[PDB]
Amino acid sequence: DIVMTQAAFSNPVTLGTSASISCRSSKSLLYSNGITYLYWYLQKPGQSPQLLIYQMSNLASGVPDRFSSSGSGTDFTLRISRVEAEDVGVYYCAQNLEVPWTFGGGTKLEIKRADAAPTVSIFPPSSEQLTSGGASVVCFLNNFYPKDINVKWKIDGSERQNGVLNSWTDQDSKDSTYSMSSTLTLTKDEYERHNSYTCEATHKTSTSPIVKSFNRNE
Ligand SMILES: CO[C@@H]1O[C@H](CO)[C@@H](O[C@@H]2O[C@H](CO)[C@H](O)[C@H](O)[C@H]2O)[C@H](O[C@@H]2O[C@@H](C)[C@@H](O)[C@@H](O)[C@@H]2O)[C@H]1NC(C)=O
Numbered sequence: 001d002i003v004m005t006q007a008a009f010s011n012p013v014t015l016g017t018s019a020s021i022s023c024r025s026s027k028s029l030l031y032s033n034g035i036t037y038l039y040w041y042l043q044k045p046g047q048s049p050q051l052l053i054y055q056m057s058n059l060a061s062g063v064p065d066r067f068s069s070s071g072s073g074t075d076f077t078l079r080i081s082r083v084e085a086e087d088v089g090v091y092y093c094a095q096n097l098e099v100p101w102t103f104g105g106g107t108k109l110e111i112k113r114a115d116a117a118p119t120v121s122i123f124p125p126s127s128e129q130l131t132s133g134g135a136s137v138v139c140f141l142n143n144f145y146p147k148d149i150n151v152k153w154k155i156d157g158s159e160r161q162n163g164v165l166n167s168w169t170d171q172d173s174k175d176s177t178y179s180m181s182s183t184l185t186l187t188k189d190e191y192e193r194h195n196s197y198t199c200e201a202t203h204k205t206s207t208s209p210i211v212k213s214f215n216r217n218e
Pocket of ligand 1: 096099101
């Protein structure tokens with residue numbers, strides 16, 4: 001079978017400038033009839049893949065001329081002109097010169113927007129979770145860029161790393177920001193043995209961490 005190779009990540013692209021997604025095939029995709037059997041699909045965050053370009057030079061319905069594909073029989077690039085925030089997602093190349101259809105690994109397009117610092121919220125366990133015996137503490141960091149960010153938990157002044165897990169959203173379709181939750185998972189019993197709960201978010205927008213704290217007994 002034919003192998004389609006593409007890089008997982010792109011250089012972050014500025015709104016209004018040009019993005020390029022590369023793809024290469026293990027065999028030429030140019031058939032003796034003059035058609036190159038290359039396709040481009042876009043998978044947007046939370047959605048199924050959808051066709052952008054078919055057989056190199058055809059624009060799928062409702063796709064603007066901003067998208068264009070060119071290349072040889074083996075080396076291809078998708079060009080996206082005047083990229084908009086809603087262009088974010090994973091771009092897949094594909095071939096059906098031969099059976100079976102095969103797909104590249106996908107390349108994520110990232111929007112390079114101006115840095116933005118996170119808005120930080122801390123959430124003590126609710127009475128409902130406590131009734132269940134659980135005491136997850138959540139620190140939410142909302143609408144920041146770029147994606148890389150560090151959260152530190154302090155419990156009564158001592159750093160806590162065990163039981164802490166971080167998870168991000170995808171880049172937002174409109175404001176091109178990320179959000180992430182840091183969750184400290186504790187039992188009610190563990191939770192009720194300390195008073196002060198702090199999360200500290202370190203991001204490149206500042207040298208000072210943004211710090212949120214609460215006291216369990218308030
Ligand atoms: C080995 O030949 C290729 O086989 C693939 C998979 O069967 C064909 O793709 C399917 O074609 C049928 C129609 O024959 C339907 O369109 C399916 O949805 C396709 O998955 C290749 O056929 C080419 O590509 C299709 C999208 C059509 O445009 C078709 O006319 C083309 O020939 C077929 N490719 C070649 C080089 O023969």
